[PDB]
Amino acid sequence: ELTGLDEFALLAENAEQAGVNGPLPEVERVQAGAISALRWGGSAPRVIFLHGGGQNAHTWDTVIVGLGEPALAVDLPGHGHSAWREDGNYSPQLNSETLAPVLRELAPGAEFVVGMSLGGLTAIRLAAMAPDLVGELVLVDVTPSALQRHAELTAEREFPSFQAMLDLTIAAAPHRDVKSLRRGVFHNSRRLDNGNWVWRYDAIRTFGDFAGLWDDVDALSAPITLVRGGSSGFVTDQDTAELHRRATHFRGVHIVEKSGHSVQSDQPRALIEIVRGVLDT
């Protein structure tokens, strides 16, 4: 299997995963350097989606299809089709600084932001440095403290075959449907000329200053709602109460059963329902 394959070849699998029938939504990869994004059915968008570390904007495909709504899914810097830095800084503070121009242009009227991990926190930042852009906010299995805990704990390249990247991520999660895993890896890697394959994402040398972030939370007037992986230990009861404590309008936690950290990968049907309810109807 050789892959001169369009990045949207597998949309139908996404539609099936979402349990939605009917015609697929309009889509194009869009850019304002230094950023790439996929704009959806638009003539839009009502919602912005920010992915997590190691991921790219394709993790939201099934969620976005499942959801009726026009939207902007962004490749954070260091990720997918967005520029790397090699100062290694894809901190939420940096990420927001550069996205803010881009979201003014593309998706000027987006009511909502949905961020998982790295994207959730950069969305926090974006909400503080640009309240006009962030009407309401949705965090996917992340708290400023919860990611710092992760950063601390994990403070510590060319592949002969696509299959070898596949096996590697099979090892990460053997219990998962290969067809899905293959999809995610497809959108997350590319072939060189050598024949050899490589990850589209950069390795992260730096997360941000997590305390200014909390001052941003204190400062945020946008309502936050949190979504947790029922089987994810990433975010704790303590982390949650704290979020509630510091937050101006905390709308609560939805805890999704049988989902890990990446809720959009694990139980997108449920994430769809949660997000749907957040659009006030």
Numbering used by the authors: 38 to 193, 205 to 329
Copy the relevant paper text.
Rv0045c, participating in ester/lipid metabolism in M. tuberculosis, was predicted to be a hydrolase belonging to α/β hydrolase fold family based on bioinformatics studies. The Rv0045c gene encodes a polypeptide chain of 298 amino acids with a putative hydrolase activity. Sequence comparisons show that Rv0045c shares a low sequence identity (<30%) to other members of the α/β hydrolase fold family, however, the consensus sequence G-X-S-X-G of the nucleophile elbow and the catalytic residues are highly conserved. Similar to other α/β hydrolases, it has been previously shown that Rv0045c can hydrolyze ester bonds within a series of p-nitrophenyl derivatives (C2–C14).
The model clearly contains two distinct structural domains: an almost globular α/β fold domain (α1β1β2β3α2α3β4α4β5α5β6α6α9β9α10β10α11α12) and an inserted cap domain (α7α8β7β8) which interacts with the α/β fold domain. The α/β fold domain of Rv0045c consists of a mostly parallel, 8-stranded β sheet surrounded by α-helices on both sides (only the second strand is antiparallel), which has been regarded as the “canonical” feature of the α/β hydrolase fold family. Sequence alignments revealed that the “nucleophile elbow” of G-X-S-X-G sequence motif is located in the sharp turn connecting β5 and α5 and is highly conversed among these enzymes, although Rv0045c shows no significant sequence homology to any other α/β hydrolase fold family member. The polypeptide region, Arg205 - Ile252, in Rv0045c forms the cap domain. The flexible region in the cap domain, from residue 194 to 204, is not visible in the density map of Rv0045c. The active site formed by Ser154 and His309 is shielded by the cap domain.
